Amino acid sequence: SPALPAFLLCSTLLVIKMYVVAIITGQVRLRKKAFANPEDALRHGGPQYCRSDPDVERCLRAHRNDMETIYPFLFLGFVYSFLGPNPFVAWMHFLVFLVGRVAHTVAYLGKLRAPIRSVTYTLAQLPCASMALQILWEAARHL
Amino acid sequence: SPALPAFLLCSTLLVIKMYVVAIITGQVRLRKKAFANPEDALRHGGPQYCRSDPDVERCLRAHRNDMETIYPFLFLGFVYSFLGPNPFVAWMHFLVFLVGRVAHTVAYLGKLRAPIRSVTYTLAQLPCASMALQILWEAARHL
Amino acid sequence: SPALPAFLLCSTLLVIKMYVVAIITGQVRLRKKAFANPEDALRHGGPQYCRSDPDVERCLRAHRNDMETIYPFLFLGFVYSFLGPNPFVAWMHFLVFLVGRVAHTVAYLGKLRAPIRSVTYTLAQLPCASMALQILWEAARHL
Ligand SMILES: N[C@@H](CCC(=O)N[C@@H](CSCC(=O)c1ccc(-c2ccccc2)cc1)C(=O)NCC(=O)O)C(=O)O
Ligand SMILES: N[C@@H](CCC(=O)N[C@@H](CSCC(=O)c1ccc(-c2ccccc2)cc1)C(=O)NCC(=O)O)C(=O)O
Ligand SMILES: N[C@@H](CCC(=O)N[C@@H](CSCC(=O)c1ccc(-c2ccccc2)cc1)C(=O)NCC(=O)O)C(=O)O
Ligand SMILES: CCCCCCCCO[C@@H]1O[C@H](CO)[C@@H](O)[C@H](O)[C@H]1O
Ligand SMILES: CCCCCCCCO[C@@H]1O[C@H](CO)[C@@H](O)[C@H](O)[C@H]1O
Ligand SMILES: CCCCCCCCO[C@@H]1O[C@H](CO)[C@@H](O)[C@H](O)[C@H]1O
């Protein structure tokens, strides 16, 4: 499976990119003193710090959007890598996803004007939709 | 692995079903003018459209519930497909999950009376619980 | 792959642990009469029970944090199991994750003082970060 190393490289970079979002979220909570739990707020200055914050909420939305998109790619890309795609075509699917997703997180956390985030989201979903349909046909025909 | 094509067909349909929920959510935000981000609200009419909406919130709950259930199935069903189950028994596990999950999303977004959604949820979790236990025993015995 | 049974045992226990969190959340909603949907509230006593609750919110945060961490482990641990790690070293990665994650959920739902939850979270992420980097290098070198 000549496409497998490319898949594993892109996927693992995206997982690390999600870990970076978790790290950023934690740092933002600490810096803004905005905690979700009274036990956390009390350790960090008092009950008034058990509160929501727009920058924390933004981080959580970026992380959730990652879960909505990167997790399915992990499944789809892995299966697709084993079904014998042209390696260059596979590379292009994986690269468009990687670049689109990294750009999405930059656009989201960086508060870039619309529709920059929505374009990057849509661009990244294209190779996912492609892989899903290709897998669907391969599965269907082996039933 | 005679169960693998059936697994891949059901799983990929469920992923596409999750993409449809993402699409619906976006359309609902646009139609109700209810955006989570000031950059989005400003592109679409002004800051007063940076607001929550019950139909948007409902879409997000359906999508989150999908992530809580479909993602584990993707892992469990894949592993289970390789452990040599009777193919018909495997088919039944996958079909009950697929039908239960599609019904769950229809019940959720369609605002069907309780306990229709909760029944479909519980029904779909049954084959997941079954596969998890079967995998647990197979793993345990190879330790 | 001598590490595979250990991976599948730990992963499947963690999935079951996530199902337990879903079950607890449902029980808490019912016990506190705090539902997210008017159709649910109406079946269970009236519209005033369509409301948020801190214990329900806490359960949802624990479940979300599981999705943020356990799902990537399912991918990373599976790939890592096939790359020929020393089986004892692999066992240690999987065990630290399993124990850290179970402890995280106990700390979260049990409202244990800070920084108990954050320590368990960080400890569990260590083997995940390790596996991710090891996979990154293996993938990179096969490009
Ligand atoms: N969505 C989470 C993200 C941060 C988080 O999960 N925090 C922990 C407390 S630990 C402290 C921390 O912020 C943190 C963040 C990232 C990492 C890390 C990650 C990957 C590799 C290496 C290190 C280590 C520690 C928690 O239990 N949150 C409760 C919850 O999720 O509801 C949040 O809003 O709190
Ligand atoms: N839970 C999300 C769902 C929609 C979404 O993710 N929107 C993007 C902006 S893109 C516009 C769009 O709505 C959209 C939706 C689906 C698709 C699509 C999907 C699959 C295949 C093909 C096409 C393409 C575009 C975002 O960054 N949201 C910010 C966030 O998640 O916090 C939300 O509530 O916004
Ligand atoms: N995060 C969810 C967790 C509970 C849930 O998903 N509830 C269903 C209604 S079903 C009743 C139930 O609570 C329940 C919970 C767990 C299980 C179960 C799980 C695994 C194995 C075996 C059994 C079976 C039933 C729902 O549609 N919630 C709407 C939503 O997620 O927005 C919530 O806050 O409601
Ligand atoms: C590699 C580790 C870097 C992670 C950076 C996050 C640092 C901030 O972590 C903070 O720790 C507190 C401990 O009580 C928690 O209560 C807070 O919720 C959390 O934001
Ligand atoms: C296949 C593509 C169909 C997706 C339908 C979603 C269309 C609505 O997408 C909208 O785009 C805006 C761009 O600025 C965003 O700000 C909004 O959040 C989003 O709802
Ligand atoms: C194995 C099954 C045990 C799951 C325990 C959860 C029981 C509570 O489930 C309740 O069912 C109601 C039905 O209308 C829903 O409206 C509530 O949201 C849900 O909390």
What three-state secondary structure class fits C5?
helix
CA distance A105 to A119: 12
Within 10 angstroms of residue B84's Cβ, the number of other Cβ atoms is 12
Is the distance from CB of C90 to CB of C11 less than 8 angstroms?
no
* H-run or E-run covering A85: none
From residue C100, alpha-carbon distances to A112, C70, C93, C104 in Å are: 37, 11, 11, 6
CA distance A7 to A98: 10
Domain C1-143: give its CATH architecture.
Up-down Bundle (1.20)
- Phi, psi dihedrals of residue B35, rounded to the nearest 5°: -115, 150
Closest by CA to C25, choosing from C70, C67, C57, is: C57
CA distance A22 to A36: 14
From residue B132, alpha-carbon distances to A74, A84, A100, B60 in Å are: 20, 30, 34, 27
In chain B, helix, strand, coil percent, each to 5?
80, 0, 20
Residues in chain C closer than 8 A to A46 (CB atoms): none
Q: Name the one residue in this structure whose structure tokens are 């106990």.
A: C106
Is the distance from CB of B14 to CB of B55 less than 8 angstroms?
no
CA distance A119 to A124: 9
Ligand 3 lined by B126 (C-beta under 6 Å) = no
A140–chain B nearest CA distance, Å: 6
> Radius of gyration over alpha carbons of chain C, in Å?
19
Within 10 angstroms of residue A2's Cβ, the number of other Cβ atoms is 14
- Asked if C42 is an interface residue toward chain B (Cβ–Cβ < 8 A), one would say yes
Is the distance from CB of C32 to CB of C45 less than 8 angstroms?
no
Nearest CA owner, ligand 4 atom 16:
A40
| Residues near C21 by beta carbon (within 8 Å), at least 6 away in sequence | C59, C62, C63, C66, C105, C109
Residues in chain B closer than 8 A to C40 (CB atoms): 114, 118
**DSSP letters along C38-98, please?**
HHHHHHTT-GGGB---HHHHHHHHHHHHHHHHHHHHHHHHHHHHTS---HHHHHHHHHHHH
CA distance C96 to C6: 12
Q: How many Å lie between the centroid of ligand 5 and the Cα of residue A60?
A: 19
Asked if residue C58 belongs to a known ligand binding site, the reply is no
Domain locations in chain C as residue ranges: 1-143
CA distance A67 to A61: 10
What is the experimental method?
X-ray
- Asked if B23 is an interface residue toward chain C (Cβ–Cβ < 8 A), one would say no
Closest by CA to B128, choosing from C66, C15, A68, C5, is: C15
Q: Is the dihedral of CA C117, C118, C123, C127 positive or negative?
A: positive
CA distance B132 to C8: 10
Interface test with C, best of A1, A10, A11, A12 (most C CBs within 10 A): A12
C8–chain B nearest CA distance, Å: 6
Pocket of ligand 1 (CB under 6 A): A 19, 22-23, 25-26, 36, 60, 63; C 61, 65, 68, 117-118, 121-122, 125, 129
Tokens of A72: 């399915």
- Phi, psi dihedrals of residue A19, rounded to the nearest 5°: -60, -40
CA distance A45 to A53: 16
From residue A108, alpha-carbon distances to A44, A92, A120, B43 in Å are: 27, 24, 10, 15
Q: Which amino acid is at A109?
A: L
- In terms of Cβ atoms closer than 10 Å to its own Cβ (0-12, 13-18, 19+), residue B52 is exposed
Closest by CA to A104, choosing from A19, A32, A14, is: A14
Is the distance from CB of B101 to CB of B109 less than 8 angstroms?
no
CA distance A23 to A109: 13
Ligand 4 atom with the smallest distance to the CA of C115 is 14
Closest by CA to B70, choosing from B107, B23, B118, B15, is: B15
Tokens of C18: 């996530």
CA distance C138 to A88: 20
Within 10 angstroms of residue A42's Cβ, the number of other Cβ atoms is 15
Ligand 2 lined by A118 (C-beta under 6 Å) = yes
Is the distance from CB of C68 to CB of C105 less than 8 angstroms?
no
Asked if residue A108 belongs to a known ligand binding site, the reply is yes
Torsion of CA A63, A69, A73, A75, to 10 degrees: 80
